[PDB]
Amino acid sequence: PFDNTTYKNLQHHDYSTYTFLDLNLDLSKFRMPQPSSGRESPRH
Amino acid sequence: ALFVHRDTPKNNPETPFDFTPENYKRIEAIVKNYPEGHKAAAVLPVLDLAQRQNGWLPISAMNKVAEILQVPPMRVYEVATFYTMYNRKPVGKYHIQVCTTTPCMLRNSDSILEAIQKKLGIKVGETTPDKLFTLIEVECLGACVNAPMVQINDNYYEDLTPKDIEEIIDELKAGKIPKPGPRSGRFSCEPAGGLTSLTEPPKGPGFGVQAGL
Amino acid sequence: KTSFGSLKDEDRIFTNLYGRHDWRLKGAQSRGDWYKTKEILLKGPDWILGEVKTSGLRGRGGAGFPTGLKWSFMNKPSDGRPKYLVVNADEGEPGTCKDREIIRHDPHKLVEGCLVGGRAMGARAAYIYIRGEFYNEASNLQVAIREAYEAGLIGKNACGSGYDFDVFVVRGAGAYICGEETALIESIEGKQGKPRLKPPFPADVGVFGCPTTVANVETVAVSPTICRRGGAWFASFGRERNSGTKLFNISGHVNNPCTVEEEMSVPLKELIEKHAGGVTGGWDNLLAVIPGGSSTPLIPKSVCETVLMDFDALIQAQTGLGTAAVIVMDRSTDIVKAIARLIEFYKHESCGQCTPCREGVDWMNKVMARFVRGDARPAEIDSLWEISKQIEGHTICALGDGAAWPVQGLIRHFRPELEERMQRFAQQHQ
Amino acid sequence: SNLIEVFVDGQSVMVEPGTTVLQACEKVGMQIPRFCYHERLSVAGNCRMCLVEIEKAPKVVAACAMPVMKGWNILTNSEKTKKAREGVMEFLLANHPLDCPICDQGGECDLQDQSMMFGSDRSRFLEGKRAVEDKNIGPLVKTIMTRCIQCTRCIRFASEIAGVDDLGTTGRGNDMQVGTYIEKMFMSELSGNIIDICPVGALTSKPYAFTARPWETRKTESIDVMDAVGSNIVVSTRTGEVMRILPRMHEDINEEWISDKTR
Ligand SMILES: NC(=O)C1=CN([C@@H]2O[C@H](COP(=O)(O)OP(=O)(O)OC[C@H]3O[C@@H](n4cnc5c(N)ncnc54)[C@H](O)[C@@H]3O)[C@@H](O)[C@H]2O)C=CC1
Ligand SMILES: Cc1cc2nc3c(=O)[nH]c(=O)nc-3n(C[C@H](O)[C@H](O)[C@H](O)COP(=O)(O)O)c2cc1C
Ligand code: SF4
Ligand code: SF4
Ligand code: SF4
Ligand code: FES
Ligand code: FES
Ligand SMILES: [K+]
Numbered sequence: 030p031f032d033n034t035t036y037k038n039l040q041h042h043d044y045s046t047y048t049f050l051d052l053n054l055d056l057s058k059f060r061m062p063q064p065s066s067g068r069e070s071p072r073h
Numbered sequence: 074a075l076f077v078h079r080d081t082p083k084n085n086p087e088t089p090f091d092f093t094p095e096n097y098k099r100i101e102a103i104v105k106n107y108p109e110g111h112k113a114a115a116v117l118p119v120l121d122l123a124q125r126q127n128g129w130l131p132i133s134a135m136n137k138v139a140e141i142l143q144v145p146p147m148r149v150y151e152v153a154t155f156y157t158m159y160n161r162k163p164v165g166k167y168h169i170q171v172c173t174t175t176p177c178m179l180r181n182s183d184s185i186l187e188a189i190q191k192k193l194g195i196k197v198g199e200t201t202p203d204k205l206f207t208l209i210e211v212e213c214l215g216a217c218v219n220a221p222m223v224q225i226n227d228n229y230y231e232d233l234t235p236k237d238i239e240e241i242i243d244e245l246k247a248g249k250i251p252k253p254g255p256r257s258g259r260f261s262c263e264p265a266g267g268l269t270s271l272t273e274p275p276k277g278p279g280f281g282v283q284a285g286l
Numbered sequence: 287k288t289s290f291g292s293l294k295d296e297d298r299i300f301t302n303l304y305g306r307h308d309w310r311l312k313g314a315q316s317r318g319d320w321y322k323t324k325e326i327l328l329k330g331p332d333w334i335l336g337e338v339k340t341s342g343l344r345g346r347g348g349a350g351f352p353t354g355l356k357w358s359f360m361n362k363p364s365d366g367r368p369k370y371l372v373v374n375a376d377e378g379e380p381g382t383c384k385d386r387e388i389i390r391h392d393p394h395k396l397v398e399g400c401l402v403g404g405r406a407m408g409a410r411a412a413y414i415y416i417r418g419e420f421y422n423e424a425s426n427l428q429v430a431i432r433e434a435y436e437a438g439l440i441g442k443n444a445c446g447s448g449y450d451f452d453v454f455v456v457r458g459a460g461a462y463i464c465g466e467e468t469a470l471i472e473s474i475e476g477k478q479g480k481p482r483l484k485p486p487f488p489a490d491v492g493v494f495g496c497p498t499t500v501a502n503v504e505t506v507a508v509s510p511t512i513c514r515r516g517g518a519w520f521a522s523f524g525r526e527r528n529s530g531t532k533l534f535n536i537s538g539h540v541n542n543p544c545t546v547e548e549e550m551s552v553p554l555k556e557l558i559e560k561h562a563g564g565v566t567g568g569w570d571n572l573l574a575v576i577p578g579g580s581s582t583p584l585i586p587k588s589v590c591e592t593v594l595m596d597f598d599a600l601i602q603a604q605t606g607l608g609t610a611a612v613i614v615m616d617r618s619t620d621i622v623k624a625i626a627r628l629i630e631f632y633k634h635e636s637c638g639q640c641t642p643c644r645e646g647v648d649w650m651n652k653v654m655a656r657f658v659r660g661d662a663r664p665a666e667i668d669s670l671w672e673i674s675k676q677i678e679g680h681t682i683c684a685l686g687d688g689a690a691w692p693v694q695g696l697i698r699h700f701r702p703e704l705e706e707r708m709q710r711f712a713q714q715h716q
Numbered sequence: 717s718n719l720i721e722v723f724v725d726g727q728s729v730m731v732e733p734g735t736t737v738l739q740a741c742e743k744v745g746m747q748i749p750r751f752c753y754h755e756r757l758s759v760a761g762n763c764r765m766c767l768v769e770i771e772k773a774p775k776v777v778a779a780c781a782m783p784v785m786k787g788w789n790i791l792t793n794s795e796k797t798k799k800a801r802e803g804v805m806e807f808l809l810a811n812h813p814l815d816c817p818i819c820d821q822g823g824e825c826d827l828q829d830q831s832m833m834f835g836s837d838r839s840r841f842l843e844g845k846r847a848v849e850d851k852n853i854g855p856l857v858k859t860i861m862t863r864c865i866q867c868t869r870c871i872r873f874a875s876e877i878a879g880v881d882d883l884g885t886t887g888r889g890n891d892m893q894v895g896t897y898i899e900k901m902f903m904s905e906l907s908g909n910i911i912d913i914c915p916v917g918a919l920t921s922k923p924y925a926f927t928a929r930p931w932e933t934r935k936t937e938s939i940d941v942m943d944a945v946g947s948n949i950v951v952s953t954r955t956g957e958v959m960r961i962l963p964r965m966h967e968d969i970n971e972e973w974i975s976d977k978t979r
Contacts, residue, residue, distance in 0.1 A: 031274050032306070032307075033268070033271075033272065033274070033306050034306070035306070036260035036261065036305050036306065037305060037306065037307055037308050037309065037313070038261070038305040038309055038390065038391060038426075040426070040429070041253070041390075041422040041425065041426055042252060042253065044227075044421075044422060044425050046125050046227065047099070047125065048425040049421065049424050049425045049428055049455075049457065050099040050102070050103070050118075050122060051099075052425060052428035052429065052431075052432060053099070053102050053103060053106065053428065053455075054098060054099055054102040055432060056428070056431065056432055056435060057101075057102040057105055057106075059432075059435035059436075059441050059442075060105070060106070060441065060452045061410075061411070061441065061442065061450050061452050063105065063107065063108045063109055064108050064109065064368045064410070065108065065109035065110060066108065066109060066110035066111070067110065068110050069109075069110060069112070069143075070110060070112060070113060070143060070144075071110070073110075076886040076887035076891065076892075076893055076897070077849060077886070077893075077895065077897060077898070078897055078898050079899075080898075080899075106454050106456075108368075108494055111475065111476075111494050113475070113476040113477075114474060114475050114476040114494070115476060116476035116477075117456075117457075117458075117459055117473065117476060118456070118457060121418070121457065121459060132898070142476075144476070145881035145882075147881055147882055147883065147884045147896065147897065148476075148477070148881070148884065150884065150886060150897040150898075151477070151478050151884045151885060151886060151897075152459075152476070152477070152478060154886040154887050154888070154897065155459075155461065155478045155479060155637070155886075155887075155888055156418075156458075156459035156460050156461050156479075157459075157460040157461070158418055158459045158460040159459065173627070174380040174580070174627065174628070174631050175380055175381075175576075175580065175613065175624045175625075175627055175628050175631070176380055176381050176537040176538055176613055178624065178627060179537075179538045179539055179613070179615060179619065179624070180538075180539075180543070212378075212380075212462065212631050212634055212635055213378060213379070213380040213462070213580075213631065214419050215377050215378065215382065215383050215386050215417060215419065215420065216383050216386070217380065217381050217382065217383040217535055217537040217543075217611065217613075218383055218535055218536070218537050218543040218544055218545050219383070219543070220537060220543065224419060227421045227422070228421075228422070229422075253422065260304070260305060260306075261304055261305045261387070261390075261391070262303070262304060262305075262383070262387055262544060262545040263304045263544060263545075264542035264544040264546070264561060264562065264563060265541075265542045265543075265544075265563075266541065266542050266563050268304070269542075269544070269546060269560065269561045270293075270295065270298070270303075270546050270547065270548075270561070271295055271298060271301060271302075271303060271304055271306070272295060273295040273296070275301045275302070275307075275316070275317045275318070276296060276317075276318070277316060277317070277318070278315065278316070278317070278318050278321040279318070279321055279322075280296075280318060281514070281515045281516075281519065282321075282322065282514050282515070283514070283515065283516035283519075286322055286325050286326065286329075286513075286514065461888075478885065483761040483778060483781045485782075485783070633889055633890065634889065636888070636889045637888055637889070637892075638866065638885070638887070638888050638889045638890065638891075638892030639762045640761070640762045640763065640764050641762070641763050641764050641765075641804055641807050641808055641865070641866075642764055642803065642804060642807050644807075644866065644889065644890055644892065645807040645808070645810045645811055645890060646807050646810070647889075647890075648811075648889065648890040649807075649810055649841065649843065652843040653843075666842075669840055672840075673840075676799070676800075676803030676804075676806070676807070679775055679776065680764055680767055680776065680800055680803060680804065681764070682761065682762070682764075682778075
């Protein structure tokens with residue numbers, strides 16, 4: 030049954046102040062190992 | 074509204090600030106999004122996280138972020154004074170950001186600004202005496218077809234009237250949280266008088282796929 | 287084909303623009319997103335770049351550079367440094383509210399655009415610099431990116447093609463200058479959002495010193511639809527060197543301020559009267575139109591009658607296309623107050639790096655603030671023209687150009703209203 | 717020889733690739749006006765005074781930053797180059813304070829001299845000028861930040877040569893302010909060279925402050941003895957009394973700097 034009448038994007042009504050960073054912590058294992066420049070910072 | 078720091082009793086490097094341990098987990102997760110040797114790239118999300126924990130940035134959050142990322146404090150001070158979200162003075166808990174650029178001004182955001190000024194009892198920049206509301210006047214928030222609109226700490230409240238923003242401020246003073254959207258009959262960005270486009274159902278996967286794919 | 291516009295619901299790239307369907311993976315898979323992405327990626331960067339250069343896709347950020355020629359600047363051998371796609375999601379332009387809709391309502395289209403574009407340029411990952419004000423949109427996009435990783439669509443072995451491609455979202459902090467590509471790069475690097483000087487273009491030295499392409503959300507998200515439907519199909523919409531579809535933000539004084547997708551060379555009168563429900567008062571109530579967001583010069587009613595809403599016809603109409611964000615202004619508009627508030631925007635959002643913008647934009651705001659009251663004499667209009675011509679072309683990025691242009695459009699089309707404002711000030715105060 | 721051939725006002729000069737347009741004009745003895753370019757600091761490109769015309773290219777380029785390409789004809793004295801210089805000088809003098817009499821930099825100011833040479837002769841600015849808060853970075857450098865033109869030689873010096881990182885730009889727009897953002901004291905061993913490289917009177921010598929004036933100072937080219945480095949200096953005297961010690965440019969000892977003990 031097709032619906033072109035309701036706004037399906039209601040998930041963002043319940044987001045909190047830490048939502049984005051909880052999602053980043055939930056994604057921190059799905060990611061590739063970061064490439065290195067060899068040094069710890071440009072002041073090292 | 075100044076871009077220097079003067080040590081108050083409530084803002085100094087001996088003002089207490091530290092992250093919760095879940096914020097240290099989140100900071101490690103942020104730093105892992107950036108390449109090795111460019112740990113300094115995570116100044117902005119970690120300092121934003123410090124604002125999300127504290128509500129505002131004293132000069133101990135700036136120094137703590139500079140300590141954990143091993144950057145100079147001055148390079149975090151440049152960031153915290155460059156951007157208009159890093160609140161360097163303690164704002165109220167509901168931070169009403171009224172947009173007043175030209176697309177919101179054409180649809181009478183000034184009536185909303187006057188309505189908030191007469192509903193809260195303050196003016197632009199000030200804070201209400203309960204320390205719940207701070208009203209400032211910001212630039213384009215990127216909701217121009219839903220003009221006029223406001224932003225209250227995270228959330229866009231769009232297509233407003235003076236009565237709609239009075240009603241939203243009333244249900245904020247009751248301790249609840251409203252629905253972050255337009256307050257006219259439409260939902261996000263369609264024409265208000267009806268759907269001039271996208272009336273049909275979509276075609277599904279595979280429509281118009283050229284030969285060789 | 288000479289008549290343009292009337293884009294049908296079947297040729298819409300941004301189906302579910304309105305949030306009427308499920309923006310999640312179960313909805314986006316039912317609309318063509320993430321279909322045969324593996325067969326797109328296995329056909330190499332060269333076929334993808336050939337289809338994009340075939341498709342006539344120009345820059346949907348607003349400058350309008352040819353997108354495939356731009357992305358081919360990364361098609362070069364590796365020299366130790368990694369490569370990055372960076373997706374410009376800042377969207378600070380007054381009038382412009384469409385990439386908010388792309389992030390919030392079609393996020394998987396953006397993630398598949400990141401994957402196909404990064405495959406086209408050999409990019410290791412994707413940093414999507416979203417605006418810090420778009421918090422719900424950022425959490426929304428991170429939900430969809432988690433759906434893309436958990437389905438195995440991105441990351442390790444992306445869609446089963448043996449390609450490794452992460453997708454990151456970096457949130458901004460409230461600066462309109464961090465939508466310019468090099469200031470955005472500096473905003474990723476943990477620094478003030480001050481633009482770099484060109485050259486180095488980001489294909490040589492970009493984010494972290496790596497080769498980099500910064501492209502808009504619109505010109506990234508329409509790329510898998512181009513690589514599925516073919517180049518010549520998308521090239522068959524709009525005029526030549528104006529190939530395709532475009533999201534228009536008809537804001538301002540219309541009955542229905544809306545975001546809609548339409549063919550590239552649609553008429554402006556037809557767009558306003560057909561999607562926005564016309565100007566508030568009919569077509570005889572129109573005064574001026576800022577056609578493509580704030581950085582483009584206004585044009586009066588006598589030009590907006592026959593004008594086409596693409597790059598070339600608006601350059602011939604002494605303005606620019608820009609973000610295709612239509613700002614409609616009627617006869618009840620203090621137009622000098624509107625342009626002066628727009629210059630007030632361009633001084634509150636200007637990073638203060640080089641001399642001409644840092645000083646002259648504040649000086650133009652003070653002159654425009656006296657023009658609103660009329661507190662000037664008619665030599666200062668030509669003086670302001672020369673100030674704008676000294677800002678234009680002398681800056682680091684085009685915020686100086688995009689600030690001088692509303693002044694030049696206002697003066698060029700409404701010099702007499704400034705002069706009669708000043709002379710009635712002079713009679714009533716002396 | 718992989719030199720490339722360019723043209724400066726028509727005159728053919730040979731440059732190694734990677735040469736900036738400003739150095740390509742320096743190789744025929746023409747000094748392009750500049751405020752933020754310093755040949756021992758890194759390139760910033762943010763005063764726009766070096767905007768020079770490349771012909772058959774409809775846009776002035778920043779000569780301090782722009783590497784030359786093959787076959788360019790650099791036009792240092794054309795019409796749009798001079799309009800670029802006059803306009804940029806007009807924006808530099810839009811908010812600069814009328815302090816030339818009470819300023820120590822007068823007579824030895826970059827902004828005065830190339831306002832005279834490359835700028836206009838009058839003002840179109842009719843508004844009120846900005847005013848900036850003064851800072852206390854110590855007993856050696858008198859800080860009057862209204863005179864600052866934000867050329868960022870401060871930050872490049874104290875980030876590259878002094879290695880201190882106390883200075884930066886706080887704010888944004890016309891309210892952007894070079895400073896330290898706190899009451900922090902910039903005491904390096906090389907900290908007085910920001911008095912040298914400030915092109916304006918924003919960073920002046922607090923001991924030398926108000927005492928003398930450069931056109932009456934007699935220049936005497938002498939040697940440091942404060943350490944075993946042998947820095948080459950100017951002991952500038954006025955009517956029989958030592959007024960200050962400036963550096964000399966010696967490419968192999970003290971390149972153009974001196975320590976604060978010397979200064
Ligand atoms: N979408 C938005 O929210 C906004 C868009 N704009 C638009 O931005 C426009 C200005 O664009 P800009 O980024 O300042 O510059 P634009 O003139 O240079 O260049 C467009 C793109 O092509 C690349 N490019 C240009 N020339 C190149 C060359 N010779 N070699 C290699 N790459 C080259 C640039 O790196 C850039 O990514 C304005 O006209 C306005 O329409 C402005 C403000 C907001
Ligand atoms: C001051 C300034 C602000 C800009 N802001 C944005 C922006 O917010 N979003 C965007 O996509 N492009 C913005 N641009 C244009 C970018 O520089 C760049 O051209 C674009 O992001 C990517 O090129 P594209 O048009 O091919 O997508 C801005 C340019 C300037 C000069
Ligand atoms: S012209 Fe304005 S926006 Fe651009 S680098 Fe300079 S201060 Fe920044
Ligand atoms: S710094 Fe130069 S231009 Fe400014 S007041 Fe001093 S002498 Fe005059
Ligand atoms: S104080 Fe002087 S050296 Fe420092 S940025 Fe300002 S003008 Fe340049
Ligand atoms: S103008 Fe207020 S949201 Fe863009
Ligand atoms: S000298 Fe090239 S811009 Fe300052
Ligand atoms: K000085």
